[PDB]
Paper text:
Inherited missense mutations in the [name] ([name]) gene, within its olfactomedin ([name]) domain, constitute the strongest genetic link to primary open-angle glaucoma via a toxic gain of function, and thus [name] is an attractive precision-medicine target. [name] has no known function, and there is no glaucoma phenotype in [name] knockout mice or in individuals with a homozygous N-terminal truncation mutation or hemizygous deletion of [name], but rare non-synonymous coding mutations lead to toxic intracellular sequestration of misfolded [name]. However, not all mutations in [name] cause glaucoma, and common variants are expected to be neutral polymorphisms. Among the common features associated with pathogenic [name] misfolding, we demonstrate that a single metric, [name] thermal stability, can robustly segregate benign from early-onset disease variants.
Residue numbers in the entry: 244 to 502
Amino acid sequence: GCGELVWVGEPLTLRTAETITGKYGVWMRDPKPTYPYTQETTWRIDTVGTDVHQVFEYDLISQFMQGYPSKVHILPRPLESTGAVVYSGSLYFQGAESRTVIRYELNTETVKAEKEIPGAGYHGQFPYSWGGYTDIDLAVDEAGLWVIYSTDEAKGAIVLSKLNPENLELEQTWETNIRKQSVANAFIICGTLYTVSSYTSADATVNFAYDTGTGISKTLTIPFKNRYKYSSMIDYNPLEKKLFAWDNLNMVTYDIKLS
Ligand SMILES: [Ca+2]
Ligand code: NA
């Protein structure tokens, strides 16, 4: 059931972090779960600080919302920023102070692939507008795995590449005209990249779209509310067809409607 994004609902708070380590972070579910995980399995990474390596895993939504993790993974190398995703049994994350994407198989705690994103800026060159070293943002949509970034050659405009999820090879690349540091975050739905105008405003918008099928860029005015005024992470989950976000200690989700 694919289509163009036409509406975003009110943010729903699922969990509020209890320490400043959780002011910003990423939380994720797998749109292609694999044993021993299910559609309920939830991963959470608080990303404040300089040696981020703990991943909280919750077998059940009840545990994610009301209780303790069922497992803590200690990543073998530290992680950068809020851009990570989980896809088909692996956490895909960026190595701290690097342009390297790492595929970490969760059930075996094994690194399966590492890839330098060619020419990608990193560590504060092309972050989203809030900073936070958000230069590299992974994404999953109905067609699989992508990475959102920029390069000097693109002069800071958003570049997106489709990734092979097994070995991280780039399969195809598109260059937009949207300055990455001028938008708060971005995500991909049904092959279209969407951006959010502000990470602070209760009256933000989903303000730009780039359709990878046609190469056409559009301006949009879809209301988007940052309930807690500091959104560090905004991603799309194509199985649930919802936005997942992290907003000033709060793990939130937004319903959407496609046309
Ligand atoms: Ca994102
Ligand atoms: Na992401």
